[PDB]
Design a protein around this nucleic acid. Sequence first.
RNA 1: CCUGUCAAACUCCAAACUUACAGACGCCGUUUGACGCGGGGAUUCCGGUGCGCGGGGUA
RNA 2: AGUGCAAGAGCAAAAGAUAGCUUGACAGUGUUCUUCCCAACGAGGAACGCUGACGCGAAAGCGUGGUCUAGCGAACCAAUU
RNA 3: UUAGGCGGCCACAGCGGUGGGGUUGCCUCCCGUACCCAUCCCGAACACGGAAGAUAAGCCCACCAGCGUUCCGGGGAGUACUGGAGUGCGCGAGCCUCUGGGAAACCCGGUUCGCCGCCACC
Lengths: 95, 186, 154, 140, 160
Amino acid sequence: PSSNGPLEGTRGKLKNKPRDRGTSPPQRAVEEFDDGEKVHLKIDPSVPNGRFHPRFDGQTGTVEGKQGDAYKVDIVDGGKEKTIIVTAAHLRRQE
Amino acid sequence: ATGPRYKVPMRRRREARTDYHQRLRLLKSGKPRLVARKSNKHVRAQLVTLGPNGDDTLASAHSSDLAEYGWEAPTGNMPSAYLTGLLAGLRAQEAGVEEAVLDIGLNSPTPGSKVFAIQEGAIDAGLDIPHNDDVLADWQRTRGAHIAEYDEQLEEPLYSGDFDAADLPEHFDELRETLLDGDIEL
Amino acid sequence: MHALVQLRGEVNMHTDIQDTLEMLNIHHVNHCTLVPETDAYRGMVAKVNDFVAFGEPSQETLETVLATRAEPLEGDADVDDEWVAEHTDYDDISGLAFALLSEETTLREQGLSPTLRLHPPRGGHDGVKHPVKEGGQLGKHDTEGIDDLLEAMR
Amino acid sequence: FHEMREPRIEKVVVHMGIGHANAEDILGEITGQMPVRTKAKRTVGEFDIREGDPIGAKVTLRDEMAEEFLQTALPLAELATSQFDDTGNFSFGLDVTVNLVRPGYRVAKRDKASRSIPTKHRLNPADAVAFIESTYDVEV
Amino acid sequence: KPASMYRDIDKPAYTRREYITGIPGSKIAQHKMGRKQKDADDYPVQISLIVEETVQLRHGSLEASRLSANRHLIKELGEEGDYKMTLRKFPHQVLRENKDGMRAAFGKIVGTAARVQAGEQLFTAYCNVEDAEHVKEAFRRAYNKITPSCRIDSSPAGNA
RNA sequence: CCUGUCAAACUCCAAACUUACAGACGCCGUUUGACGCGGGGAUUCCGGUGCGCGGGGUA
RNA sequence: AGUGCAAGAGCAAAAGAUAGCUUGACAGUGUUCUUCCCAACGAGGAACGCUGACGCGAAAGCGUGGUCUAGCGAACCAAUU
RNA sequence: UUAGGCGGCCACAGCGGUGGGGUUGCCUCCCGUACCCAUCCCGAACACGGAAGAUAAGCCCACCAGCGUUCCGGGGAGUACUGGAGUGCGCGAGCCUCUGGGAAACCCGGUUCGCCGCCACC
Ligand SMILES: [Cl-]
Ligand SMILES: [Cl-]
Ligand SMILES: [Mg+2]
Ligand SMILES: [Mg+2]
Ligand SMILES: [Mg+2]
Ligand SMILES: [Mg+2]
Ligand SMILES: [Mg+2]
Ligand SMILES: [Mg+2]
Ligand SMILES: [Mg+2]
Ligand SMILES: [Mg+2]
Ligand SMILES: [Mg+2]
Ligand code: NA
Ligand code: NA
Ligand code: NA
Ligand code: NA
Ligand code: NA
Ligand code: NA
């Protein structure tokens, strides 16, 4: 990479297909998850806050409590365990 | 509309019925919304909660089902508003609901307006709702004092159908009195 | 139920392909195993397709091979009718074989090594640089194609 | 059908597009209510670089205030065809514009469930000429 | 310079002019020849020159062959004969040349070329059954000025 | 309207494929203790080649 | 379109425009990610909390500077609170 | 739901178009400014008070496919591309065979003129 900032190489994953453009529905920005629940991590291009580092887009972690309104999701980056601060807006229940 | 790339607003935004930016701030309290809506001849008050497939209304009141308790007056004014809120609040209280946040939809937060009235009644029913007393109308205008004093400048009855001549804010007191009683059929 | 026979060595074969052959209990060239025809297994042999010879053997053939090359989970003990009878849920090789093809049991469940260590093909095989449709000995075979091979490796 | 379809005057806006006012006095007296300063946008070589700054004034009249202004304004003009909008509006003259439309126009001006007016229910130059022409003056 | 330096299609597609500057102009004089005012359907015979190998043809080459072909037709059918030939391909691919050693080797812009996939028709002529042999001879000359071997394929025309 | 072509820094589309988690089968571990944790000792940080995909370069 | 500046991306009852008011560009202390994928490593950055004190708003709520990714600096020593 | 309120999915719901529907019921338009409130000017809007009138708007109901969108058939196409294998071919560029996957455009014919949840309600 010519630079190493967080949004480097994210042109695709952090952009919306023209039609999904605009403010997102509130329903999923308010979803409540319970500790232990498996959730898929995907940043919503339309929601600025509550995001995590783009590298984790695609992960499927486990909710293990929260911080403020955001959730604390445990994931394993390669062989390393990490905890990710992320709001529901960028989460979907597995299954 | 125009092409594959065209963006169509959410249905309820097309219909200009739901302010989604507000709906979000609203849902954040995690409490039930006290939906206060108006009509030319009526005033509605619903207690809504979130649901897997849409909102759930746990308890509501309509100015039309007010008469069912004695209301013989019109149904699109302050006294009517307060009362409709109170009734809903009571049913709400019955349903097991205790707190709520005021969702006034696309209405304006004008001081003393009817939504706030709907909020006052609901509050008086024993429901906890974040509010601001000095944004509510003074007790009298709630009773309908402003209307009576308007019929005072009579010369012609303010009311077509025969419901008093100088009007009766008392009927309001009588109706509130009725609701506040613990025998009423909710 | 297909018979799997590794015909190409490990040197240079992808690790993930070698690891599969290993999960299918084959660790040496000319080693054969009996695999059920399930979705999970099909995926595996499809992946091993270029270094193996597989197909559904005829009842007789299976019997000839089980007799000649089957072994207990431990030891030399010849797996013959009498052995089969005294140690398995069947009366004789034919009984065992029929159960294998019908996929009602496996060589392990009956106390047999999952692998049939065959002998080099007498008369040689058709080459390991081409598949069956090109005259090679690699890939899927006819029940008659598989039998000729298994029988030559008897 | 006709009643909730027959034209009416929604507003008569009268403004003077000067360019830098002392003219507000006349619009107030000529109409009957206060005027409104008119700022401009973008910078212009005509020493009109200032974005937000007094440049004109206007008055939006509705109801009687509007008619009582037309019962004198209209007379001072020779209305013509081309001078008409596609929606059935028109402006003559000191500018004087007249907005014409049918009953339930509030549908598109309110806040809740607002909606644009169906073309069929929109006004027309013809229907416009008619309505007005039928009130103390001549068309083309 | 030899076409051996550019006839292969292995470098990335290099066409974005919003990022490339100093691109020489094309030497191709015209793409449509003959009676361009007429329609291709007004002709009974349609013959195309099909490239047999996927390659890159430098603009000087397209012009060199297009020229030698039309020039033949003009000579056989007159400067206004009843025919119309088309060079359907355009030289979008920009070419470089590193002209320091392999240091800072990214080359400078020196030309352009057209990428043609084998099987495609480079040239297409439309004529009357009588001039079919001239148009065939024109193509026999055109393919002698481009890298690949070609097929002079006749399409609408069962007049043999 | 018709007609002629394109894109590493275009996309109305769109694979194979790679990838997170879970289940199942397989294989493996529970005296051969896996997975994991803590500690001692390194060597190593001139690599090369084939194949696939590459970027540069006439090569 | 606009949104201070590369480029890519976000945004329409707004994240833009206008108006008004205001100083959360606040003090203290953390959790987590990043810097350094995996996989150890400082300064720096960010996300997300809590405690305290505030601003706005009817209220939910928003404000841990600028819509997001650049705008940064150890020990010793000095000055400063 | 003989016309309502709050939503979920967020065009299968968009764009355009046709027909139908409301005496004390509903939603509206509509009527009207003493008040709460309001327009940097206008009761236009916002807010309040109200029924003389109306179904022309909106809205609800029924329906049309020309455009846009969703999905499906048949064809394009098992084509293009591609994961695994080859002492197969080719000067080479590259191609081919076997095995496991598999488009896109476009054409023709269907589908789509929203679906679903909670509440209230002759
Ligand atoms: Cl993170
Ligand atoms: Cl409302
Ligand atoms: Mg990319
Ligand atoms: Mg043994
Ligand atoms: Mg021999
Ligand atoms: Mg051989
Ligand atoms: Mg990759
Ligand atoms: Mg911010
Ligand atoms: Mg020093
Ligand atoms: Mg200092
Ligand atoms: Mg109608
Ligand atoms: Na969105
Ligand atoms: Na140099
Ligand atoms: Na040639
Ligand atoms: Na740090
Ligand atoms: Na001003
Ligand atoms: Na109507």
